[PDB]
Amino acid sequence: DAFSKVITSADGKAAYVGGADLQALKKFVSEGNKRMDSVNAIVSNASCIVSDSVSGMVCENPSLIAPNGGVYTNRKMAACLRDAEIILRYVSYSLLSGDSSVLEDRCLNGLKETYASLGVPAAGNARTISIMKATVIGFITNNSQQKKLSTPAGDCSALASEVGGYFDKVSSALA
């Protein structure tokens, strides 16, 4: 409940879990150690993941940056990069905790409608999420070409599938 209460607290002030508490938390979800490396992969690379994904959305559809475009002007581009990071972080928290209940409750519930009212395009979102998904899976499966994780060698395919499922939850909600 240590982390859970951070989500619902008024100030969202930091909680720290170490020692026996952390040991117990790790025992409650599958593959606790690989799971922590996987969460670390996401958060340690958050800026590049978000930047490459939004960049790919635009290079696939450069009209998004033309006048009337979804990310025309720095103000809109910045709001997009922010949302990408927000979603990525709710996904990182889902992988940490072993379930998507907070992602669905505090990130996805109402998001499609909010985007509808703003004219935030579903096709662009779909591409951004698909790239974020591929990037994260890339790191976890040793398929990233520029930077590899500093972990013992082994197989993290199960966690890659799990996190893929969390991204798919986002994609489904926004479709």
Binding site: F3, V6, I7, S9, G12, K13, A14, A15, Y16, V17, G18, G19, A20, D21, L22, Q23, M36, V39, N40, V43, S44, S47, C48, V50, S51, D52, V54, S55, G56, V58, C59, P62, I65, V71, N74, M77, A78, A79, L81, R82, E85, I86, R89, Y90, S92, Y93, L96, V102, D105, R106, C107, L108, N109, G110, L111, T114, S144, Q145, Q146, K147
Partner: protein
């Protein structure tokens, strides 16, 4: 419900098994080198990154697929 306040969980993972410690950073009990920190913060706009994406979106980096 999504609260439209830009707030998201910020998770940090620490592995200090190598025994290197920084003063004033002990925030929980434990001596096995592991810690996880989570806070809930508004995610802020980054003007520099936005300006760079606008300029550089057409460049494939990181040995990525098209």
């Amino acid at each position: 419900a999504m609260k439209k306040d830009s707030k998201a969980p910020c998770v940090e993972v620490f592995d200090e098994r190598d025994g290197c410690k920084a003063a004033g950073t002990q925030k929980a009990s434990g001596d096995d080198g592991f810690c996880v920190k989570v806070s809930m913060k508004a995610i802020g706009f980054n003007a520099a990154e936005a300006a760079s994406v606008t300029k550089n979106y057409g460049i494939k980096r990181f040995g990525a697929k098209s």
